[PDB]
Amino acid sequence: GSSGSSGDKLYPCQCGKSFTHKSQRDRHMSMHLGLRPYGCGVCGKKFKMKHHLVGHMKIHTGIKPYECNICAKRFMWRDSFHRHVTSCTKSYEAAKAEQNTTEASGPSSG
Ligand SMILES: [Zn+2]
Ligand SMILES: [Zn+2]
Ligand SMILES: [Zn+2]
């Protein structure tokens, strides 16, 4: 074994994403197509009728007392609310550059 080389095998999807397996990429392709006019943008469900969806949406319904500051996202749970916001800011701070002047970079003479 002197040496070896290789890349990475994956499976592209209609949307553009790439999965490790074909079955994982396929399921994402069939879902893309239009199945029902009503779709639950909370869990990932769907219903033919509008009333058929409501009887299910009642499982997600609920006021969001906790909301982010950067993305202003809404979260019903506390642990998740803070758990997310905590990071959501981490990055924001980096950009804040409250007192971080962007000084040009050093060139290269070769
Ligand atoms: Zn896809
Ligand atoms: Zn749902
Ligand atoms: Zn956020």
XYZ file of C-alpha atoms in Angstrom, residues 26-99:
74
model
C -35.765 9.562 -3.235
C -38.117 10.121 -0.299
C -37.201 13.800 -0.610
C -38.055 13.745 -4.316
C -41.508 12.181 -3.990
C -42.378 14.656 -1.236
C -41.451 17.579 -3.490
C -44.260 16.800 -5.935
C -47.727 18.122 -5.155
C -49.784 15.745 -3.025
C -52.239 17.880 -1.057
C -53.184 21.588 -1.149
C -52.970 21.734 2.646
C -49.649 21.156 4.383
C -48.644 21.513 8.026
C -45.578 23.744 8.070
C -44.911 22.721 11.664
C -44.377 18.955 11.649
C -44.594 18.027 7.978
C -48.118 16.683 7.545
C -50.709 17.236 4.814
C -54.455 16.968 4.210
C -56.757 16.964 1.182
C -59.417 19.097 2.869
C -58.981 22.266 4.928
C -60.982 20.945 7.882
C -58.913 17.753 7.875
C -55.811 19.842 8.572
C -57.336 21.957 11.342
C -58.207 18.910 13.422
C -54.464 18.271 13.380
C -53.057 21.800 13.588
C -54.734 22.017 16.995
C -51.754 19.954 18.146
C -49.282 22.729 17.331
C -51.449 25.783 17.999
C -50.272 27.915 20.906
C -49.044 31.405 21.752
C -45.294 32.034 21.768
C -44.388 34.098 24.861
C -40.685 33.707 24.094
C -39.210 35.286 20.963
C -35.654 35.756 19.696
C -34.020 39.163 19.254
C -31.975 38.676 16.084
C -34.250 36.492 13.959
C -37.228 37.368 16.158
C -38.166 33.685 15.987
C -41.021 32.334 18.105
C -40.693 29.416 20.524
C -43.268 27.847 22.843
C -40.730 25.907 24.908
C -38.299 27.631 27.272
C -35.264 25.344 27.111
C -35.392 25.502 23.313
C -36.153 29.228 23.323
C -33.073 30.188 25.339
C -31.020 27.287 23.982
C -31.486 28.745 20.498
C -31.307 32.469 21.255
C -28.084 31.779 23.152
C -26.395 30.761 19.900
C -28.448 32.924 17.540
C -26.654 35.804 19.259
C -23.191 34.253 19.506
C -22.819 34.830 15.764
C -24.571 38.205 15.809
C -22.026 39.417 18.363
C -19.138 38.547 16.046
C -20.617 40.947 13.493
C -21.586 43.538 16.104
C -17.954 44.665 15.992
C -19.025 47.314 18.503
C -15.357 48.262 18.840
